[PDB]
Design a protein around this nucleic acid. Sequence first.
DNA 1: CGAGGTATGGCACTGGCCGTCGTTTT
DNA 2: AAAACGACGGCCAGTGCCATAT
Lengths: 411, 399, 974
Amino acid sequence: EGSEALLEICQRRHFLSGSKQQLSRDSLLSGCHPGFGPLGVELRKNLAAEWWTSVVVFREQVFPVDALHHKPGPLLPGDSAFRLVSAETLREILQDKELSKEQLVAFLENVLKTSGKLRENLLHGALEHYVNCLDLVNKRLPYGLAQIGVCFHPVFGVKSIGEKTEASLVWFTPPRTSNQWLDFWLRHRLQWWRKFAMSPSNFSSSDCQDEEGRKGNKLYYNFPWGKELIETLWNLGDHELLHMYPGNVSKLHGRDGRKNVVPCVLSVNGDLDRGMLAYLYDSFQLFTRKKNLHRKVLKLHPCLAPIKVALDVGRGPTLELRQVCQGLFNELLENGISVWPGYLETMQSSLEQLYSKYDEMSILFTVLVTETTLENGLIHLRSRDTTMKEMMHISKLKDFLIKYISSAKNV
Amino acid sequence: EALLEICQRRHFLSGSKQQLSRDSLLSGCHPGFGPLGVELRKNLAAEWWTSVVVFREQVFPVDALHHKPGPLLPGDSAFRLVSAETLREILQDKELSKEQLVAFLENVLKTSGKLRENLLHGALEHYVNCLDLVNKRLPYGLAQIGVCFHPVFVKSIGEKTEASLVWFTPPRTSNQWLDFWLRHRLQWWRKFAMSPSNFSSSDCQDEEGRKGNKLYYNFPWGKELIETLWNLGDHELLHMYPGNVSKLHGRDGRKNVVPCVLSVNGDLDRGMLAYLYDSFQHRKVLKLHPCLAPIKVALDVGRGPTLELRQVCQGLFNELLENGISVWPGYLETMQSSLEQLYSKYDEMSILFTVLVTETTLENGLIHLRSRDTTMKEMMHISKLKDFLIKYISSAKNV
Amino acid sequence: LRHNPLDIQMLSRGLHEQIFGQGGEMPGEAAVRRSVEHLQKHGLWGQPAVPLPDVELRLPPLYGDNLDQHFRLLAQKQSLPYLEAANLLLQAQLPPKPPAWAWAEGWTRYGPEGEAVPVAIPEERALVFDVEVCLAEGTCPTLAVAISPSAWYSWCSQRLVEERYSWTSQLSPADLIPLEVPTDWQEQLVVGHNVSFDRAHIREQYLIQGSRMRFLDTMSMHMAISGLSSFQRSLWIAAKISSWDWLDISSVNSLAEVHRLYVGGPPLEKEPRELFVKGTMKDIRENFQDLMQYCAQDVWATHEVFQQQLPLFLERCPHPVTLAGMLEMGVSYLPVNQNWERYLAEAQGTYEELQREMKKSLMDLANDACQLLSGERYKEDPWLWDLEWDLQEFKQKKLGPCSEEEEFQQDVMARACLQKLKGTTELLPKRPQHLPGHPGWYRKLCPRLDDPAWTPGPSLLSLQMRVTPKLMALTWDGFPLHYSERHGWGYLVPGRRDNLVVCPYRAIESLYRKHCLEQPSYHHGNGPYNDVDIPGCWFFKLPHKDGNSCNVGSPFAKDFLPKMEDGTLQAGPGGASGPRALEINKMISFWRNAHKRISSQMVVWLPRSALPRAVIRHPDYDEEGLYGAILPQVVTAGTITRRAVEPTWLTASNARPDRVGSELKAMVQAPPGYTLVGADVDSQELWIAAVLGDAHFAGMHGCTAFGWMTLQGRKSRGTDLHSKTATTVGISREHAKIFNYGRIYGAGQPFAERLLMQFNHRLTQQEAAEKAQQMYAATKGLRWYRLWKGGTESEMFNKLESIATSDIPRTPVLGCCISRALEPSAVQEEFMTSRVNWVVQSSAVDYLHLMLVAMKWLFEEFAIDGRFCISIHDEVRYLVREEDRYRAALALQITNLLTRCMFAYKLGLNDLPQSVAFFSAVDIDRCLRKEVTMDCKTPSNPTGMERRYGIPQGEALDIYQIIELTKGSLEKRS
DNA sequence: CGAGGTATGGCACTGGCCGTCGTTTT
DNA sequence: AAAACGACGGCCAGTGCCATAT
Ligand SMILES: Nc1ccn([C@H]2C[C@H](O)[C@@H](COP(=O)(O)OP(=O)(O)OP(=O)(O)O)O2)c(=O)n1
Ligand SMILES: [Ca+2]
């Protein structure tokens, strides 16, 4: 199909990792793949930063939270989830005649009630820290907790565990505004997903119900093989809060205007791994003139592209060009622009091949310094979007890029 | 101690007072940090990343999974996952019970996985594939920051977030590359420390004869290991890829050689606590370095018409946020408590400056500004404020 | 009685006797025989119809001896004080301007000898008032000047004198001009030029409780006396089509031109720098004296204009009803709450979001286009080949190494090396060059770097740009689009081998041949305009809904949406790209056009202290909300017909499922404890024309076939004349309204058939033309009889023509005279269609005046606690107290009845058919909307008014339900 | 001899006139 | 060293087409 090329490119430029076999669709979706390469790590970091900026930075009632990766203590029986135990204790238990006849079959109950499990959702820690975070805003009822972290899920040795990077937000609100807040957050999250998308129509939403009859909204990305869930919204209500803090319900309330009412919980959970995959597929864009301009390139958003600038050297006196490129690279890093130091790479390919390599890596701009840059302050610039060359004075370069990215947010 | 009370009162540490303790924090089995602790740890990680990875062409990020499947070495100290699906099948048939259940323990090693003890193994696994990123230019590094699980003596589980750098270098200059790093890392800790003396370095010897260095911070109870550097040679690389060593070669001096591996591992939680103690050195104020303080400025309102002052404060809030300055919106309470108590609260939170918008700001734009360190009040034009703040940051970075 | 000689149900015995007397002369034998013959000729005779239920009511006393005298007395009672004040103004004697203007804030009165004294407010019965506002500072009024008999007044804004860093961005009643007297006498009159704008800046006008103060506009009186049509306005200017005697007696609405026309004298100088539009507050502060002097000059000019105008207006509209109608029409009022602000946000963001999806989709294409520059490949593109593929030149003047510790120098040595090289400003011009490398067409779409609103990429591109269709590779029936300078947009059909930077005709022929695989010209349409030189192709104009004369300005016009659905118009990328772009365009067109006006609406928020007690105690009251008002800036008479004119509220669209921001009118929400009660006149102008024809022909209702047909049928059964036409032709009822009214006012058969083909997609040219021909022949037959004579509506056309051809045309009902610039002596046979339509349109204006007078009289009669909310031509809406709302429901109905009888009285008919006796249904609601049932779903608010805002359904009640809820009474407690 | 009418306003484009500033003549 | 002599944007007004209402 047409999706083989995308995976091949992601493997060549180190977006993904591992062998071709390990990178099947099932492994990617489940989360049991080997992992991502450095470019994938940077892309995920950029996406996480954008999510944090859109969800946490510009709101007065949002705070971070950190939930551990395991659930210790007693658990309900029969869940059949993995358990945490140290190999140092795998022999001393049975040593010296500890009911060594048939009770070791009932030891499974011990396995059920002697070890914890791996964190499966970020919601539990947020519910635990609800009470602690209530003290920040003098119990002002509308307030949220946001987190990003890895979670473990069983997948069907015959079964394994898949790891998924997920971003979770829990919003405590007045019960009366629960549905309005649900609609508001649905619209806002859908807008955020569409913002970076080249084709924001491929993202879609749907309504959903279940046994409890609680309203829900779900967000899907249209991969070439079909719609895949990327984010969900649940209007849980207050059952979980009561169950975690039963009996003395009076402590659970918060201020809604002049009233003091029990909060309603709205939960949103997006998958950052699926988000990165969806954005890669969108960027690759899996019309007579379009077919005639089949350039392989990932049009990742400027706010999301792992690498911004590529810097190299032109033919001439190597020492002076190297010194000026060192200065330029240090300045670009100092202002806060990631740079690919191509000036340190040996010459083995022409300009066209280098441009192709940088396009596959999705680098916004290519900066070139030559003898003319010592003769005068002008350097060559090339833009990924247009492939058009330009001349620019070095002194202003730091500003221009800072403007470009800064304006990419508000296009 | 008073420091832990302040940390608990200002949402640096989570969990009930019954839970927080020195041993739990050191081991990593504590409930977790609060939002302020999370922000401080994020700032520390960002500073470390900028110092180590940003300004070097030969350092790259790496992603290592939190667990490793498949057969594993038996009889050791490390967390393992008990079979999950098997819990659904044994409850309908017994295999004769009795003394063949010992083999069940062996069956654990047949299927059970293991969590992540360190980032070194993941980096080593990546090494062969990632060497292609530098055209086999032997001297290069891989950096990562991640959580690791450690048994604590039923065994408890402690989680420690750590930053790891694996440096592959030619054997000849490796011993010189070690000391180099031993300097920079040691300098890095000193960069943000009000008392850089309390950070120290020591030389250590390995039973195999390989030397290394350990970085310690002097907490009031004693010197604690915050970071460690080990020179390991080619032992791990050979062990992980037994057989044909050809693929482990790298081009140094225009010839093939098997690199030596140096491991640098620093505990970011221990570093967090070390900086908390350092910055806490006749009032309870946490003088966290401006580059590390989670909250820069606090915004509030004076006595007067609420709507106008709230609009002005919201405009200033957006202006400060857009420039990368973290702001705590204290103007939603309208000074329901005394001003000195507010100053003390913000000092405990380690906020650099407190800005008070008053009715006179509508007339002329003058605003009251108080500093965390000098503690001297000033009148400034609001339009200036932003730029001034930025400078006060950048200057601190340079000096 | 009960039935007329033509078996048409009439007003019941009780109401008919209460309205008409027995003195009416029964029509003679000849008239009835002519009516019967006419009805038999058309097949309308011998068809009984079920009568509607009778209505029994006892109306309030009607003064005088008949309807006309009663209406005259009511209008005189309403309008006496304002006329007294105007007459007081006419005799005003004032000294010259003060030597120097005062600087204090507030109101200052200037006495003789130039002395200035502070006063709280002008203490006058009448004034000439003008306000100047600093636009850059928002909407808070800056200064003002007023003149009264024997006094000058100057008003200075507090923001003008004081210096503050910031001011409140939400308007309050505390920062507006105080221009009303607390509880000589009452009913002050305010005069000025464009008086609605001045009214908008009065603190007391926004109070929910009504005020006596009324306003007269010199512009409205100019329109009534010597107004000019839009065409006449355009032709009068540029005079610096075959008759020109009207120019010397008419002028445009600008104050200087009106002053010159009415008093002549030395011209009026302008302020050269336009500081109130361009300058800042400091400019006003420094140039205070000149600005105040110019304001005084304008006020004096307006005073002279009013003095010379009033007698002519009194002469040309002698009927007292017109003056009171204008006075009551000049006091529009709209309520709103905090939701309005949310609406402003909700639309704008939504707009942006859609505009982000659209531009993005275009921008990417632009980014992909630049590659065609390589190898000159653009020469092969059948769309972008004709663009500027320029290339401007940049312009100039004239090993195993070890680690190190010495890198501290390597750092600085590098940094300094850079710091030197950045000093090379020798060869760079002071004025930065603009993207020379990029092609010119791409450069045009990129904002300049120095622009404060700069964004990356070609962010300036939009659908309306002539390049956007080129980028999208739009196609029409397999033919690419093209733009001819003379003939607008069209498409290129390849194959012109007689030569009919050059066109790539091969790249078009190949594309069309490929397209044909999925199904001297050989195609039919607007025809080949050979003057457009494009070798290898013919150019065909895109069909326009208004005929071949017009040129298409954009393929993305809403009317082209069905063609996308059918697939005639396609996009090169395929899929939903083209349809999605057109859907976005249709969704956002209204907001794109009207957001500047809507967001800039002057909204004043009333503090809790000044709000009515009935709201502060209502159960549905909402604390922490906002309760403000908007006063529409209505020109009382901005047209020849004397209709009201305003930029915003006479153009606001009705709520629609897809149109973004269409819920504008829905945001006009009554405060808790208040309701909106209103109604629309059913088939107003059609009935007016029918009754005019009936009165002309035989003085009997229904004597003409058109009058017979208009009365029959019911709206609810879909059997009214509009619905009958809609079902006969197969379109919506609104399209039927347009189809009928076009023909009524002289629309040709080509217009009718083109309109039919626009809506009924089943029809072709043949069927539509045949339908139009038959309908026109039936409605009005031949126009000649000696080698309009026949047809159902012939008498109506003849009557309208006769009224228009009169040497001094007057309204048949109230007798208002047409503007001097259109009397036959001054225009002969020019502007004939406008003059003919003026009869009916001014009749509708008189209907509106009569309805307003009747509503005011009924509210005053029984101390009803309601007020006039707004009027849109025939639509009327009133804000009422909820407890009294039901009473209002009857007050409207009776008014309609009166307005129906009075109209007939002046026509010589002494009866009114039962069919048009009452409204179809009076609407009671919490917000303004076309119908109560609609919840107003929109992309701006998909959940509708019921969930997001909580507004429930309204209710429409006919006469019988109103009577039941009122028992026929109108007293406070029955 | 035959026309729909009355209003409002938006953006896109084009022609012309004017103020910088950097080549060219004194 | 003074100052013509031009190109090259800014800016405004005028025209055309489209979108709303009744
Ligand atoms: N396209 C239009 C719409 C309206 N009008 C004029 C004449 C109409 O009589 C008047 C009012 O039209 P409505 O929309 O109020 O229509 P009616 O009053 O005729 O119909 P209804 O029974 O729906 O009120 O506006 C017009 O000339 N052309
Ligand atoms: Ca109507």
